[PDB]
């Protein structure tokens, strides 16, 4: 699996604090299969810890435009939107989440 | 950095489906520091995806006690709630989160 070995890599690349080289094997990673969510997640992640924040965002809501009912991705952009200063952009993201959560519990 | 070197191994098992091995190594870097909010985390999630549901929200729920502002946190309780079945539950926690980042925009 080479999105694995790929992620894997990057995670030790970062946590050593080779982050730009991690940036590229993630990147790497999502030309391997660009509509895989997490890793679209993980790089996204990985931009905004390394103070690339515009990209980070683009990238989250590329995983969210991609499947937009995933509360998951959702509250994920919403955190990182929140985190970056964007509170009030945050929230409607956040409150889409509820409201699917709110969907399900009504089945 | 014993709690990064095992959740490290945690994340090489289980990606290769030793996951009880890795719930192991997992409680072991909780152990370190039982504390760490984010060891706390990724424990509830690897317990989560071992079909632990109800010891993973224990966890998950515990990450939030120690820290109860947090939206990462609160709205990682919630994915995982809802995810477990349990969106009625999850809701209220989301809910939460979106309150915060409320605040948060009005400073």
Redesign the interface.
Same mark, same amino acid.
């Given at each position: 699996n080479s999105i694995?070995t790929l992620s894997?890599l990057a995670?030790?690349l970062a946590?050593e604090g080779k982050a730009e080289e991690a940036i590229k094997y993630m990147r790497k990673a999502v030309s391997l299969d660009p509509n895989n969510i997490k890793t679209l997640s993980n790089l996204a992640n990985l931009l905004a810890q390394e103070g690339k924040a515009e990209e980070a965002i683009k990238y989250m809501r590329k995983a969210v435009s991609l499947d937009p009912n995933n509360?998951?991705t959702l509250?994920?952009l %919403? !955190?990182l939107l929140?985190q970056e200063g964007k509170?009030?952009e945050?929230?409607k993201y956040?409150?889409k %989440? !509820?409201s699917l959560?709110?969907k399900?519990?009504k089945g």
């Open positions: 694995k894997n995670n030790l946590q509360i998951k509250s994920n %919403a !955190v929140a509170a009030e945050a929230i956040m409150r %989440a !509820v959560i709110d399900a519990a």
